[PDB]
Amino acid sequence: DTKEQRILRYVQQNAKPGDPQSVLEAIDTYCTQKEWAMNVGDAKGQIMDAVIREYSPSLVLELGAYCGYSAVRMARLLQPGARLLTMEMNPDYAAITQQMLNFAGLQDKVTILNGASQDLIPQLKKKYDVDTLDMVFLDHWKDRYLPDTLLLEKCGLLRKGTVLLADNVIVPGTPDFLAYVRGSSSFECTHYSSYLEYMKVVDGLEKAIYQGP
Numbered sequence: 001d002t003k004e005q006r007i008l009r010y011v012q013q014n015a016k017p018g019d020p021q022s023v024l025e026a027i028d029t030y031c032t033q034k035e036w037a038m039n040v041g042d043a044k045g046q047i048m049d050a051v052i053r054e055y056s057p058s059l060v061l062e063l064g065a066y067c068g069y070s071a072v073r074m075a076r077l078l079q080p081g082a083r084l085l086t087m088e089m090n091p092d093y094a095a096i097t098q099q100m101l102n103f104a105g106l107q108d109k110v111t112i113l114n115g116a117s118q119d120l121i122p123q124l125k126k127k128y129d130v131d132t133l134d135m136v137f138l139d140h141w142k143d144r145y146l147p148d149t150l151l152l153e154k155c156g157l158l159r160k161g162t163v164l165l166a167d168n169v170i171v172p173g174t175p176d177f178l179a180y181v182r183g184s185s186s187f188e189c190t191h192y193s194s195y196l197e198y199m200k201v202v203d204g205l206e207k208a209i210y211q212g213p
């Protein structure tokens with residue numbers, strides 16, 4: 001019995017089916033009062049919400065679902081017909097994420113793919129009929145942010161204007177990615193200072209808007 005399964009059970013015992021805000025609240029409660037977990041959390045989540053509402057993306061890719069917190073967060077703000085694709089390599093976590101989304105009533109807006117981003121990204125055009133992505137949320141292994149950004153470009157999945165939004169650019173940090181996007185003429189970057197989930201420790205999100213090749 002794992003921490004992730006305990007979070008899911010707590011949501012099943014304390015939230016309301018079909019109510020995404022009650023799911024977010026239950027997770028945040030559990031992780032504040034019982035056991036910390038690496039969800040984006042409410043402080044950074046509010047910044048994500050503001051960014052999503054600003055750009056109104058039709059197709060979002062999430063790298064690293066974990067328990068599904070950010071997938072609930074983002075999916076609840078998508079317009080009718082807009083979609084989220086989320087990649088999660090750990091089969092147990094993929095199942096928790098799907099169950100979380102089902103409980104929240106958001107399943108029609110999301111596709112949870114159980115595999116590693118480096119294997120799945122090259123399949124998005126052929127298998128999933130994706131043209132380009134409007135937004136990418138990076139929240140998987142930190143040493144994979146830069147490799148996967150470069151892969152997304154190689155596969156033709158970024159357009160002029162695609163919004164990348166990266167968690168944890170301060171803690172744990174993603175130093176190669178952050179240096180790269182800030183130094184590159186192909187990205188216009190904005191830093192949003194915030195706090196590590198459930199902690200009084202500075203963290204931040206980076207927005208990096210692709211400018212084309």
Ligand SMILES: CNc1ncnc2c1ncn2[C@@H]1O[C@H](/C=C/CNC(=O)c2cc(-c3ccc(F)cc3)cc(O)c2O)[C@@H](O)[C@H]1O
Nearest residue numbers: 038064066087088089090093116117139140141144171172
């Ligand atoms: C590499 N390709 C991949 N493709 C698909 N899924 C992938 C994946 N890599 C990892 N994953 C999945 O993403 C998730 C991993 C995320 C890694 N996150 C962190 O390490 C992390 C770590 C902290 C953290 C902060 C402070 C601290 F003291 C300790 C930890 C905070 C966060 O917000 C984090 O996001 C898991 O669900 C994992 O199975």
Ligand SMILES: [Cl-]
Nearest residue numbers: 055056057058
């Ligand atoms: Cl749109």
Ligand SMILES: [Cl-]
Nearest residue numbers: 181182184187
């Ligand atoms: Cl730049």
Ligand SMILES: [Cl-]
Nearest residue numbers: 041042043198
């Ligand atoms: Cl928080």
Ligand SMILES: [Mg+2]
Nearest residue numbers: 040139167168
């Ligand atoms: Mg994170």
